[PDB]
């Protein structure tokens, strides 16, 4: 229960998330809960056969996520503590 | 949770549904069904069987 | 004790004791060939003296973004102002943007009408053409343009597509023998946006 | 500036000095 | 302090595979449920195989079938998405 | 009302032959005689068989351990 | 004479095993190691998708939740 402690330090970081359906979701993290459920704002959703979608906010279930792409600038060694 | 010994029809994940009469239930929400039959395509019986809390999308009478 | 158990709780409890009785983690020492997973190439480092300085590469990105900031700001106006081939008519597109008539530059009144899937499609077509023909400034413009019209976050396939494009640019860079070669500025630029701007920094030309 | 892209491009290509 | 055992359990036992990568700066190859493969270095991980990765190549083929890939500087991978993990994978251009 | 565990337990006492309905997989069932389990409902399963669907075919596995998370449903046979 | 899952599992270590996943791929190899949650480590691993050997992976780790069943082999 210590990798998920790290996600929660990522407010105000903008990321891209692969969903399990393969949708790429770019936005800024407002909050991550302890089961990996993620609330975003300033959201842009890339879909297989459909133009993009802007959204003021979106929240996503932890178990619909494939992974997070993190900003390259992100300082990992710091946050891994 | 008042349904007991009252015939039930069930929908399990993976698109499969079954009908039987409840005889029991556990905290985990996993329950025992009697004289059940699995309704394809015509269907058939499986007597008494156990079912997981999950794997049960919907349940109706 | 020695009598079987009679209720699961007892069985479950009986098992648990047994479990603790077992070492949690084991490691079998054993006594004494594997498939290969092919991985696409990186970019080809630039011939010495042809690699651009970071500051240039950074300055360009920063500039590129502005361009996309405006292109997106005025998409709708241009949207409504030259029969634009079907989405899946590669040849038609190829002829269209490039010619053998002569080609249809990539104006904001033409690209702006272009939906995401199509943009992606065209790049492909143009890439395919590229592999099998010489880079021309007309290409650069088109490629640059469409790149301008790609909207993040990019689909994975799009990512791969632009990567193959970069790799080809680097490959063509090798053939060049004078800095005065026209291609060089363009090829570097292309390998800068997709490397810096589109986040594929494994392909970037980190100099020296 | 219905050709502000074509322009931008040239501008970039010409922005290369080395 | 008992938690200490956890790490001894990581040095051996099947998670060693990952702690290898963290300890030695080695690359692993993960088969993913996206039906793609990830080749990268493990910066950190937990008992669920949630992972922080560095320098990841996402590799897949498609179509006759062409190889495709894409690169990812830094990544948080949910363990759920993991199928198998190769220690010392073998890769070639 | 008999909480299921009693029914699983019963299957263990009789050493009944059972069929398992897999969570992730609908084209296939597992069949075997149950000789042990635990609170995760993991089952050691003797003389076991993959039964496939449509194809009316049965594959001998022998003694296997079946993970508990995979189980949608248990019946007798 | 009830055989229970952990003991049985520890029993398989050091021997060829065939492991089948909840998604239908399966792996054959030597069970080098195992742990509390039943993750497993395999050596000289093989690949058999839809019954077809697909690859030789050498040393591999398998997340537990993936496993459908594991069985011994000779």
């Amino acid at each position: 229960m210590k990798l998920v402690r790290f996600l929660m330090k990522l407010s105000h970081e903008t990321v891209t998330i692969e969903l399990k359906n393969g949708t790429q979701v770019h936005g800024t993290i407002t909050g991550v809960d302890v089961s990996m459920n993620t609330h975003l704002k300033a959201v842009k959703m890339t879909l297989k056969n459909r133009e993009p979608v802007q959204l003021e906010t979106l929240s996503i279930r932890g178990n619909n996520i494939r992974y997070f792409i993190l900003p390259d600038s992100l300082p990992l060694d710091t946050l891994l503590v | 949770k008042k349904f007991m010994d009252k015939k039930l029809s069930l929908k399990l994940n993976g698109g499969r549904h079954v009908q039987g009469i409840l005889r029991g239930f556990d905290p985990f929400m996993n329950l025992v069904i009697d004289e059940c039959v699995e309704m394809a395509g015509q269907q058939n019986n499986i007597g008494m069987v156990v079912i997981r809390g999950n794997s049960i999308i919907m349940l109706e009478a | 004790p020695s009598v079987p158990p009679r209720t699961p709780q007892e069985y479950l409890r009986r098992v648990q004791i047994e479990a603790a009785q077992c070492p949690d983690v084991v490691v079998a020492q054993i006594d004494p060939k594997q498939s290969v997973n092919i991985s696409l190439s990186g970019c080809q480092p630039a011939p010495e003296g042809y690699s651009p300085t970071l500051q240039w590469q950074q300055q360009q990105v920063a500039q590129f973004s502005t361009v996309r900031q405006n292109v997106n700001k005025h998409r709708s106006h241009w949207k409504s102002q030259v029969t634009m081939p079907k989405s899946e008519d590669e040849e038609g597109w190829k002829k269209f943007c490039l010619g053998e008539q002569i080609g249809f530059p990539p104006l904001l009144s033409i690209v702006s009408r272009m939906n995401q899937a199509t943009v992606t499609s065209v790049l492909e077509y143009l890439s395919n053409w590229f592999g099998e023909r010489d880079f021309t400034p007309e290409l650069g413009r088109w490629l640059y343009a469409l790149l301008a019209c790609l909207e993040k976050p990019l689909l994975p396939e799009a990512h791969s597509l632009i990567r193959q494009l970069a790799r080809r640019c680097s490959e063509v860079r090798l053939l060049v023998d004078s800095k005065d070669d026209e291609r060089v500025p363009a090829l570097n630029l292309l390998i800068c946006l997709v490397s810096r701007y589109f986040d594929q920094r494994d392909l970037a030309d980190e100099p020296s | 500036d219905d050709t502000a892209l074509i322009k931008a491009y040239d501008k970039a290509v010409a922005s290369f000095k080395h | 302090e008992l938690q200490k055992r956890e790490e001894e359990e990581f040095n051996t036992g099947p998670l060693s595979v990952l702690t290898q990568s963290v300890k030695n700066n080695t690359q692993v190859l993960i088969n993913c449920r996206n039906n793609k493969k990830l080749l990268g270095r493990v910066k950190a991980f937990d008992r669920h195989c949630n992972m922080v990765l560095e320098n990841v190549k996402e590799m897949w083929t498609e179509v006759k079938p062409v190889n495709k890939d894409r690169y990812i500087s830094k990544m948080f991978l949910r363990g759920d998405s993991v199928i198998v993990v190769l220690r010392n994978p073998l890769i070639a251009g | 009302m008999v909480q299921p565990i009693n029914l699983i337990f019963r299957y263990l006492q009789n050493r009944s032959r059972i069929q398992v309905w897999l969570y992730e997989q609908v084209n296939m069932r597992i069949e075997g005689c149950i000789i042990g389990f635990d609170e995760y409902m993991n089952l050691v399963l003797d003389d076991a068989e993959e039964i496939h669907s449509k194809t009316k075919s049965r594959k001998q596995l022998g003694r296997i351990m079946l993970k508990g998370d995979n189980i949608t449903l248990l019946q007798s046979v | 004479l009830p055989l229970n899952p952990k003991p049985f599992l520890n029993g398989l270590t050091g021997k060829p095993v065939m492991v089948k996943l909840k998604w239908g791929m399966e792996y054959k190899g030597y069970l080098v190691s195992v742990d509390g949650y039943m993750n497993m480590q395999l050596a000289n691993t093989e690949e058999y998708i839809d019954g077809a050997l697909s690859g030789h992976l050498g040393e591999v780790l398998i997340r537990c939740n993936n496993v459908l069943y594991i069985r011994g082999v000779e």
Side-chain angles (χ1 to χ4, degrees), chain B residues 4 12-16 18 22-28 30-32 36 46 48-52 54-55, chain F residues 1-5 7-8 10-11 19 21-26 29 39 68-76:
Chain B
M4 279 223 63
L12 307 155
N13 72 128
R16 356 107 154 324
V18 188
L22 164 161
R23 334 198 83 285
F25 78 74
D26 258 330
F28 281 53
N30 305 276
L31 35 84
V32 194
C36 115
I46 188 189
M48 193 173 190
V49 292
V50 181
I51 297 143
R52 280 244 283 167
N54 320 146
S55 339
Chain F
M1 171 205 62
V2 276
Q3 334 194 310
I5 196 169
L7 214 198
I8 304 182
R10 186 185 311 175
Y11 290 142
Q19 213 163 247
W21 290 31
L22 301 177
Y23 195 101
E24 300 295 351
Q25 218 156 330
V26 69
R29 308 262 223 260
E39 68 214 75
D69 57 51
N70 292 111
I71 294 160
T72 293
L73 177 146
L74 292 172
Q75 49 163 104
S76 12

Side-chain angles (χ1 to χ4, degrees), chain F residues 4-69:
Chain F
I5 196 169
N6 300 337
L7 214 198
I8 304 182
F9 197 43
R10 186 185 311 175
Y11 290 142
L12 184 60
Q13 292 164 301
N14 286 268
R15 210 179 159 286
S16 332
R17 171 138 286 245
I18 53 175
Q19 213 163 247
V20 191
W21 290 31
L22 301 177
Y23 195 101
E24 300 295 351
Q25 218 156 330
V26 69
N27 55 85
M28 158 174 151
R29 308 262 223 260
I30 296 289
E31 223 194 46
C33 320
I34 172 168
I35 72 183
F37 68 73
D38 61 3
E39 68 214 75
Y40 314 111
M41 232 22 44
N42 296 316
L43 316 178
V44 192
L45 231 68
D46 215 342
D47 215 356
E49 282 153 40
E50 279 192 28
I51 295 95
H52 296 71
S53 269
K54 330 320 203 37
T55 193
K56 36 139 67 288
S57 330
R58 314 160 60 83
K59 324 326 217 106
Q60 263 57 229
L61 283 22
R63 183 175 290 181
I64 76 183
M65 207 262 282
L66 191 81
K67 283 291 280 276
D69 57 51

Side-chain angles (χ1 to χ4, degrees), chain A residues 1-4 6-7 18 20 24 36 62-77 80, chain E residues 3 32-34 36 38 43-47 50-54 58 70 72-78 80-81:
Chain A
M1 178 99 219
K2 170 180 238 167
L3 256 285
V4 50
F6 158 94
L7 267 175
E18 205 191 77
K20 291 201 180 151
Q24 308 286 307
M36 221 151 287
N63 58 78
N64 210 331
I65 281 159
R66 223 128 212 50
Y67 55 73
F68 297 72
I69 291 159
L70 312 177
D72 181 80
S73 40
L74 222 255
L76 296 185
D77 310 318
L80 266 11
Chain E
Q3 176 266 198
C32 217
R33 325 241 281 94
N34 35 169
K36 294 179 200 184
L38 302 157
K43 211 68 170 63
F45 68 94
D46 61 10
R47 0 97 102 258
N50 298 334
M51 255 170 273
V52 166
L53 302 181
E54 267 188 339
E58 183 157 269
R70 142 215 252 216
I72 293 169
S73 265
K74 305 190 157 110
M75 164 151 172
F76 187 107
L77 179 54
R78 281 189 82 246
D80 170 347
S81 316

